[PDB]
Structures are given as structure tokens and as C-alpha cells.
Design a protein around this ligand. Structure first.
Ligand SMILES: O=c1ccn([C@@H]2O[C@H](COP(=O)(O)O)[C@@H](O)[C@H]2O)c(=O)[nH]1
Ligand SMILES: O=c1ccn([C@@H]2O[C@H](COP(=O)(O)O)[C@@H](O)[C@H]2O)c(=O)[nH]1
Ligand SMILES: [Cl-]
Ligand SMILES: [Mg+2]
Ligand SMILES: [Mg+2]
Ligand SMILES: [Mg+2]
Ligand SMILES: [Mg+2]
Lengths: 291, 302
């Protein structure tokens, strides 16, 4: 089974993406690219992240959007000043009452974008690099059959990643242990995939998308690329335990394990949002390729 | 609003948890009432600390404690002779249970200790402890000697670990949420009755502690489980690869008890993946003390 993981890494993993912006533009072939940054109270970093993507707008990148998650700091004005269009959760999907968590934000962004490719980038990154978006879309534009690209960082994984996500995947979806950073916030997906799957709530959205992509489209539909060396950032153990609890709930929900829904003495939801093509059928159909 | 888990936890802490388990050794001896107490130290290459742990338990020998055994797990250092000089009885896995070939891991050692001990109550203490305290054993056996219906006591430390808070407790919250009341379910210092420990299977390696906890709960509920404060101890740092291997086996063992299939695929390292290939051992009363008084489980019918 290590031969399967080995062949995936040789074909679907890039430690040193060579691609230039110019060759990626030339390869778009009519497809459009939307970059979405979710943001809840990220005034200190959102501008910096937007600034590294902004020079691509009008070229490789067709839309640059910050999806504000109900911030009360200066996130929106700083994201605007850095050159992003700022869209609230309510504007993205007005007739559906919002609910908390990151998964909600990413899901609503599908109704407020037009890209055939959607790129997600966390807005709390303190060291964003301008080649993030090019490296994330490279496999989608130049490799047949890829629908989800996960950006990983070399270390100079994470405690939740190595103690929770990777060992649970070994137990329940063993082929997926080849994904280095399954919980990473930087990744890109096709409209065809993202429009057609449920979105898990809160901190479960990344692992839910990975497992749903694996089941529906297969291992070769997933790729991964190295975005650069980044050290781990400190997070309190209570936040990490809360994130673990929701990663567990979403994995269990995708495998049919009855999860009690009981949190840690912490929020945990077992309810997905439905595929966006059920609420935006005409948008979704308009975005389906003729062939 | 308080949940059903919150309510059970609060009352369980009132009745079954002791932050200051101040029983005297004399009153615990007086309460033994013919029952005997075996203390078991599993040991795999702990030459630097095993003697110090034994030294703290030794003054109880002949009174509260009836036997003190280091069950050696195949050490190649000076673990055994240092345990001997410190005043313990050293028994190998092989001598403990000659008719079964050993397999590696901590669970095997504790399971085998049941055949090598005679106490009505068996106490487990890790042999790698840096700062063992002489009141560990009194505090662990208190609720077994004085509290009706208690069969398993988990000792915890106040802090001045990642697998417990990121793996064990979140998974218990999902699969057995009442058990999230236990502060340190993976702790190595704990005690149980012979009638309980002989009746349950033992999980291998790093899964033995969590397996005993869930097996006890599934048979007897929260009422049979207690916990006691052993004192203040700082977290000792372990390599990340060790923690990941521990996590993988805790997951395996929890899954087998809660009706979740498990791939048997160990952990992938970078491109190489191991195979969880160690088996649960059956209840020791299938090999020893076969006609002993069985453990009455909770009836699920009426
Ligand atoms: O409810 C939420 C949680 C996080 N987020 C954003 O998602 C990103 C990841 O959040 P995190 O670092 O707390 O895990 C970060 O950019 C947050 O600002 C939201 O937009 N809404
Ligand atoms: O195979 C094993 C593993 C650990 N042990 C002992 O169990 C205790 C807990 O081990 P640990 O801290 O490596 O998880 C410690 O005292 C070890 O010496 C064994 O006796 N056998
Ligand atoms: Cl721990
Ligand atoms: Mg933040
Ligand atoms: Mg973050
Ligand atoms: Mg050791
Ligand atoms: Mg230890």
C-alpha cells in the first residue's frame, strides 16, 4: 500500500513547483480563477495577505474577495484598502440565516464568485508569499484530472495534524495518509467539485472536503504543493482541542460513526450545509462546461 | 444549559473524585478486612528510576502492601538488579505466564502481572517516574477499600498532555461522553479489583489504559470508576513520533470497543507505513483462577 502512496507522491505532489505566472495564464484556456480569503477579525494581517495576491488581479486571477465573517475590528476597511472586494456573509447568500464557523464562510463564497477555479487563503497569515496562488492552481491548469490542490509548508504538520487527523485517516481512510497537511487553509478546488458537495461546519470544513473529494473523485483527483518554509504558530491547547473535537465530528459524520455531539468542557456541529447547486441551481448550471 | 453529561460529571466528582485523598495508611490497613494488595511496576529499560520508585513503596511492604513486583518487559540495562537491590520481587513476562508466548508492549506486561500476583486489589505504577511520592499507593487503594461499588481508581496529577487533550478526551466526548469526567484517562498510576481485571480483555501496547477504562464503563458505568489526586507533577516531554504512535493505538483500542472498524494500518512516515499487528489478550480468567467469583455486570434487561 506504500506503493500506492509512493506513486501518488511522484505524480501528484510538488516540492518545488517550477511554474511561472506567465505559463499559468497561458494555460487558463477560458477558465477563470476566484481567490477567496475568509476573515474574522484579522485587521493586523488581512491587508498583507491581500497585497501579495493583488498584482495578479486582471491576469492570472479574475476575482479577489475577502469574505468577512462578522468582524468588528478594521478588517473590512484594511482589506478594501489593500485592493480586495469585501463581501459579508449576508450579502453572499441573503435568504439563508448565517451560522458561525469557517466552513460557513467558504460555502457562502461559492454563491458570490464566478470562477471555474476557487482558491482559499487564510487571512491571518503573517508571512504570505506572492506565489501561493500560482502554486495552488498549477496542478488544476496543467495536470488532467485534478480537482483539489492542498498547499503544504515545509518545516524548519502540526499537533492536531499529526496526532488527530493523520492517525484517524490511517484508521478510516488509509490512502489519504499521503496528504501531508490535510487540515491546511491554503488550497484550491474546481467549481465542479466545490459546487456539488456538502460543506462541513466550523473547523471541520477542510477534512470534510478532502474525504468527500477522495470518495467521489478519487485519490488522483487530489494533489499537493509546497508553498515554502513556515514555522508552526503558537495556539492555546484549548483552541487546538476544540478544533480536534470538530475534526473528529466531521470525519465521523462522513463515515457514519454516531457522534454524540457533546463538546469539550466547545462548539461542535453534526449538520452540514447542502451542496450549493441545490440553492443556486441556475448559477451552477451556467458554470457547468458545455462538455 | 447543563447537558446530561454535565450533570453526571458534577455528581460523579462529588461522590467519586478526591482532590485531597488524605486517608492514613493505618486506617487503610484496618479496612483491608482480609483483602490483600499487590503492587505491580511494569519495567522496560528503566535502570535510572526503577529503584527510586520501589524505594517509595517499600515501607508499605508487610503492612498495607502485601507484595511489590517489578514485571520486567525484556530490559537490556540494569533494571532488574536495581529493582532487586531496592527491595522488590522481579518476575519476567515468561515466568509470569509460561504457557503463552509474549508480544511486545505495556498491555502485555500488565495482563501477565494478573497471573503473577495474588492480591484482591492490584495497583499499577509506572517505573519511569522521576519524582514518585510514598503516598501514591494509599491514595490509589482508598476508594477500593472504603467506597462501596468502586472497582477502578485512576490517579491524576495537578499541573504546576497533548494525546490526552487532543485525542483521548475528544474521542471519549464523541463515543462515551460520560467518561470525559476522568481527568487523566491515559494515566499509568491506577488500581483495580481482581474480580474486575480478570474479567476484561487487555489491549496491547499504548492502548491498555484506555481499553480498561471503556471496558469497565461498558460493564459497570461511572459508579465503578473513581479518581484521586496524586500531587503536583510537571509534564514530561516525549518525541512527536512517540506521541503519534501512542495516539494511533489509543484510536485503535477505542474503536474496537465502540464498534468502529479499524484499517489495521499503523502510521505513515516519510513513504513508509507500519501495520498495527498486536492482538487483544482475552480475559485472564480464561487461563487462571477460572472458577473464581465472577464480576456481576449491570443488567441491560429486567
Ligand atoms: O468563524 C470563523 C473562523 C475563522 N475564520 C477565518 O478562517 C481562517 C482560519 O481561522 P483560524 O486561524 O481561527 O483557524 C482565518 O483567516 C480566520 O479569520 C472566519 O472567517 N470565520
Ligand atoms: O513494552 C513496554 C512499554 C513500556 N513499559 C513500561 O510501562 C511504563 C510506561 O511506558 P511509557 O512511558 O514508554 O509509555 C514504563 O514504566 C515502561 O518502562 C513496559 O514495561 N513495556
Ligand atoms: Cl497525554
Ligand atoms: Mg484569527
Ligand atoms: Mg490560523
Ligand atoms: Mg521508558
Ligand atoms: Mg512514561
Amino acid at each position: 500500500t506504500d506503493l500506492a502512496r509512493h506513486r501518488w507522491l511522484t505524480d501528484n505532489s510538488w516540492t518545488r513547483p517550477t511554474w511561472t505566472v506567465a505559463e499559468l495564464e497561458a494555460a487558463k484556456a477560458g477558465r477563470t480563477i476566484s481567490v477567496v480569503l475568509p476573515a474574522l477579525n484579522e485587521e493586523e494581517t488581512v491587508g498583507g495577505v491581500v497585497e501579495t495576491i493583488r498584482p495578479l488581479l486582471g491576469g492570472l486571477v479574475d476575482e479577489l474577495i475577502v469574505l468577512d465573517s462578522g468582524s468588528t475590528d478594521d478588517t473590512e476597511i484594511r482589506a478594501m484598502a489593500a485592493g480586495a472586494r469585501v463581501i459579508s456573509r449576508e450579502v453572499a447568500l441573503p435568504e439563508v440565516a448565517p451560522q458561525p464557523g469557517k466552513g460557513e464562510v467558504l460555502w457562502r463564497s461559492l454563491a458570490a464568485t464566478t470562477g471555474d477555479i476557487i482558491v482559499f487563503i487564510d487571512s491571518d497569515l503573517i508571512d504570505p508569499d506572492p506565489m501561493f496562488v500560482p502554486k495552488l492552481v498549477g496542478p488544476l491548469l496543467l495536470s488532467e484530472g485534478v480537482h483539489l490542490v492542498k498547499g503544504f509548508y515545509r518545516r524548519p504538520g502540526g499537533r492536531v495534524t499529526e496526532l488527530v487527523a493523520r492517525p484517524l485517516l490511517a484508521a478510516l481512510r488509509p490512502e489519504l495518509t499521503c496528504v501531508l497537511q490535510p487540515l491546511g487553509g491554503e488550497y484550491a478546488g474546481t467549481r465542479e467539485l466545490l459546487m456539488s458537495v456538502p460543506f462541513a461546519p466550523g473547523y471541520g470544513v477542510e477534512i470534510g472536503l478532502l474525504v468527500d473529494t477522495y470518495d467521489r473523485l478519487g485519490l488522483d483527483a487530489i494533489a499537493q504543493v509546497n508553498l515554502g518554509v513556515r514555522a508552526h504558530r503558537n495556539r492555546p491547547l484549548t483552541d487546538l482541542a476544540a478544533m480536534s473535537r470538530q475534526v473528529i465530528a466531521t470525519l465521523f459524520s462522513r463515515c457514519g460513526v454516531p457522534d454524540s455531539g457533546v463538546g469539550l468542557t466547545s462548539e461542535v456541529s453534526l449538520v452540514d450545509r447542502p451542496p450549493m447547486n441545490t440553492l443556486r441551481g441556475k448559477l451552477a448550471a451556467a458554470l457547468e462546461h458545455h462538455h
